[PDB]
Design a protein around this ligand. Structure first.
Ligand SMILES: [Gd]
Ligand SMILES: [Gd]
Length: 229
């Protein structure tokens, strides 16, 4: 295998996610747990709002709540920055602009803590409309397929990504969320700096029928693409 970190993902890897958020002063925390199987680009996660009621729609947090679990085809193995940063991990930073509404800024560390892949996130949201699609909870509980466009950032020894998320509104219209992303290794080791490609990212949201707490069950299937065999 072409990076040391890539070997850490040949099997099923337990995952922990911890998020602390503050959006227009509405504070919340989310904890998630599950497992990833990057061989197949798959993961399964269950998230709980540990502070009670989530003040923003669950779909708006999907992208923030581990692209190291992507399946890179055999011919694209030299382009997997995410696994190559492991186990020291990477900082993942975004700004996410909700069209005609506010923005989230996120900073996350994704790294191994023992045998667990851990995503620890801080999120700050500002300039939201209290009666908008976000703070007004007007988004459908579903998720569209999206491509995440990745380019190398030689300078920061890292990558950049941008993409637009389409969140379905309750009336069948769409709330757009423009994502800008930077990832930089935490560790000192060499990392793989990719040619241009994308992650074909499929997400399915559901509820655990036995769960009383405000929650989201998420299954994802992601494969890298865009470089011809
Ligand atoms: Gd697809
Ligand atoms: Gd797919």
């Amino acid at each position: 295998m072409v990076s040391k970190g890539e070997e850490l993902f040949t099997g099923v890897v337990p995952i922990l996610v911890e998020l602390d958020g503050d959006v227009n002063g509405h504070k919340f925390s989310v904890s998630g747990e599950g497992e990833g199987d990057a061989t197949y680009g798959k993961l399964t996660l269950k998230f709980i709002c540990t502070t009670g009621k989530l003040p923003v729609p669950w779909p708006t947090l999907v992208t923030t709540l581990v692209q190291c679990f992507s399946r890179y085809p055999d011919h694209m193995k030299q382009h997997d920055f995410f696994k190559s940063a492991m186990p020291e991990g990477y900082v993942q930073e975004r700004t996410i602009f909700f069209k005609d509404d506010g923005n989230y800024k996120t900073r996350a560390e994704v790294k191994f803590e023992g045998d667990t892949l851990v995503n620890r996130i801080e999120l700050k949201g500002i300039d939201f409309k209290e009666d908008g699609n976000i703070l007004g909870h007007k988004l459908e509980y579903n998720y569209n397929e999206h491509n995440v466009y990745i380019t190398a950032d030689k300078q920061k020894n890292g990558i950049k990504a941008n993409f637009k998320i389409r969140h379905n509104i309750e009336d069948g219209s769409v709330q757009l969320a423009d994502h800008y992303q930077q990832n930089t290794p935490i560790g000192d080791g060499p990392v793989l700096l990719p040619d241009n490609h994308y992650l074909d990212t499929e997400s399915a949201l559901s509820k655990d029928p036995n769960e009383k707490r405000d929650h989201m069950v998420l299954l994802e299937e992601v494969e890298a693409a865009g470089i011809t065999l």
